[model samples]
Target: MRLIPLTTAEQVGKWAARHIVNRINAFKPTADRPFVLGLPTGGTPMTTYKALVEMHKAGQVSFKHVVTFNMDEYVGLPKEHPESYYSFMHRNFFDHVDIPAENINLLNGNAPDIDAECRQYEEKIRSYGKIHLFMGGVGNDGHIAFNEPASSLASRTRIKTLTHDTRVANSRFFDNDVNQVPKYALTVGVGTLLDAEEVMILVLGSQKALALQAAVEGCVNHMWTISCLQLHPKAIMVCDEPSTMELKVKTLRYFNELEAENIKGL
Candidate 1:
C-alpha cells in the first residue's frame, strides 16, 4: 500500500493526470497497442478530469489510442437522462478529449434485459485480457464503483440494489432528492477491479475519514468493498489530509515517516 497525500484537490488532480499521460506516452513509444483505462465518474474524480482536459489543450497529453471502460452506471435511467453516468462522462471528460467515440465503452443503463447486459459487460472486460489502469473513488460506506459494501467480493459485473448509504451519497446529483436516485445499478465487483494491472483510488475531505480507515485497516469483511483493493498487486491511494484523519497506527506511522518534511508543523 502507498499513501500519497497532497495538500489540495487540485494538486492531487494534476499529479494523477501527469501520471496517466506518462503511461500513455510510454505505450505509444513502444507501439504496444492502445492503452486500456478503467474510468470512474463522480465528485472525487472531477478535478482529475479537469486536469486531463487542461493537458489535452496544452498538447501535453493525447488519448488517440486509449480505450476506456467506465466503472458503473445506474440502472433504470436512460442514457439521455441528465443525471445518467453516460451523460456525466461526456460532460466531464470524454467530450473534452481527443479520444475517439468508438473506443469508449460504458455499461448500458437502459438495456432492456439487464441480466444479459451485465453478462456482456463482463465479457467485454475479458476481451481486453486485463485492464491496464483503473481509477476510482470510494463511497463514504467503503464501496468501489457501485459495488456497495456487503456486495459479494467474488461477484462479477452485475446489477445490484443501491445501498441506502449510496443512495444518500448520490442524492446531491439528483437535486438532493434521494427518491430520484436510481435504486439499482450495474457495477464491476471487487474481484473485477482487482484484475487491473494498476489501480489508483482517490479519496478526499473529512467526510471520508472513517471509510478510509476501514478500507486500509479493517478486517476483510464484505462491508468494506474498498478494502479488497488491498489484495491487488499494485494499488495506490491518492488522498487529502482531512480524509486520512481516521487512519490507524500502521498507516499513520508509515505516512508520517515518509512525509516528515510535509508534516513538520504537526
Candidate 2:
C-alpha cells in the first residue's frame, strides 16, 4: 500500500492525473493493445478528470488507444439522464478526449435483464485480460464503488441496493432531494476491482476523515470495504490533509516522509 499525502485536494488531483498519464505513456498503448482504465463518477473524482482533460489538451497525454470501464451506474436510469454514469463520463471527461466511442464501456442500467447485463459486463472486462488501473473514491461510509457495508469482498459485478446514507449523500446531485436519487445501482464488485493491476483511491475533505482513518488503520473488514485495499498488492491512497484528521500523527508522518521522493516524480 502506498499513501500519497497531499496538502490539498487540488494537488491530489494533479498528482493522480500525472501518475495516470505517466502510466499510460509508459505502456505505449496501441490499437491492438490498449490501456484498460477503470473510472468512477462523483465529486471526489471530478477534479482528477478535469486535470486529465487539461493534460490531454496540452499534449502531455492522449487517450486515442485507451479503453475505459466505469465503476457503476444507477439501475433503471436512462443513459440520457444527466445523473447517469454514461452522461457523467461524456460531460466530464470522455467527450473531451480522443478515445474512440467503441472503447468506452458502461453498465447497461436500463437493460431489460439486469442480471444478464451484469454477466455481460464481467465477461467484457475479461476479454481485456485485466484493467491496468482502477481509479475510484470512497463513500462517506468508506464503501468502495457501490460495495456498500456488508457487501461481499469476493463478489462480482451485480446489482446492489443503495444504503440510506448513500442516497442522501448523492441527493446533492439531484437538486438536494434524496427521493430523486436512484435506490439501486449496478456496480463493479470489490473482487472485480481487486483484479486490476493497480488501484488508486482519492479521498478528500474532512467529511471523509473517518473513512481515511479506517482505510489506513483498521483491519480488513467488510463493514468498511475500503479496508480491502490492504489486501491489494498495488494499492494507492491519495488524500488531502483535511481527510487525514482522523489519522494518527505518527502514521501520517511515516507516509509523508516515505513519499517525499515519490511526490517529486511527474
Candidate 3:
C-alpha cells in the first residue's frame, strides 16, 4: 500500500492525473498490445479526466491504444442522460481525447437481462486480459465502484443494490432529491477489481475521513468494502489532508514526512 498525501483538493486531482498519464506512457506502444484502463464517474474522477484532457491536448498522452471500461452505471438512466455514467465519460474525457468510440466500454444499463449483461461484461474484460489499471473513488458508504457493504470479498461483475446512504449521498446529482437516484447498478465486483495489475485512487473529501481510516488502519472487513484493497498486490491511494482527519496523527506524519523528503516519484 502506497499513500501519497497532499494538502488540498486541487493537489489531489493533479496527483491522480499526473500518475495516470505517467502509467499510460510507461506502457510502450505496440500494435499487439493495448493498455486496459478501468474508470469511475463522479467529481473526483472528473478532475482526473480534465487533467487527462490537458495532457491529450499537449501531446503528452494518447488514448488511441487504450481500451477502457467504466466501473458502473445507473440501472435505468439512458446512455444519453446528462448524468448517466456513459454520458459522463463522453462529456468529460472521451469527447476531448483521441480514443476511438469502439475502444470505450460501458455496461448497458438498459439491458433487460442484467445477469447476462454482467456475464458478458466479465467475459469482455477477460478477452483483453487483466485490467492493467483499476482506478476509482471510495464511496461515502466506504464502497469501491458499487460493491456496497456486506459485498462478498470473492465476487465478480454483476448487479448490486445501492444502500440508502449511498443513494442519499448521491442525491446532489439529481437536484438534491434522493428518490431520483437509481437504487441499482452494475459493478465489477471485489474479486473482479482485484485482478487489476495495478490500482490507484484518491480519497479527497472530509466526509470520507472515516472511510479512509477504516481502509488503512482497521480490519479488512466487508462493512467498508474498499478495505478489500488490502488484498490487492498493488494498491496506492492518494489522500488530501481533510480526508485524513480520522487517521492517526503519527500515520499522517509518516506519509507526510515521506512526501517532504522525496516529493517527486512516489
Residues 49-144, candidate 3, lDDT per residue (tens digit)? 777788889999988889999899989888888999988888888999999887899999999999999999999999998789888999876899
Tens-place lDDT per residue, model 2, 1-266, is: 99999888888999999989999999999998999999999999988999999999999998999999999999988889998989999999998999999999999899999999999999999998899999999999999999999999998999999999999999999999999999999999999999999999999999999998999999999999999999999999999889999999999999989999987663
The per-residue C-alpha lDDT of model 1 at residue 264 equals: 42
Q: Which window of 10 residues has the lowest lDDT sum in candidate 2?
A: 257-266
TM-score for all predictions? 0.93, 0.98, 0.96
Task: Estimate, for each residue in 106-137, the C-alpha lDDT of model 1 and write its tens digit.
Answer: 99988889889888978887876778899999
List candidate 3 segments past 4 Å from native.
261-266
As for candidate 3, its clashing pairs are: none
What RMSD does each model have against the real structure? 2.7, 1.0, 1.5
Error of 1 at 213 (Å): 0.5
Ranking by TM-score: 2, 3, 1
Clashes of 1: 0
Q: How many backbone clashes does every candidate have? A: 0, 0, 0
Better of 1 and 2 by TM-score: 2
Once superposed on the true structure, which residue ranges of model 2 sit more than 4 Å away at CA?
A: 264-266
lDDT scores of the candidates, listed in order: 0.84, 0.94, 0.87
Of the candidates shown, which would achieve the greatest lDDT relative to the real structure?
A: 2
Q: Give me the displacement of residue 235 in model 1, in angstroms.
A: 0.5
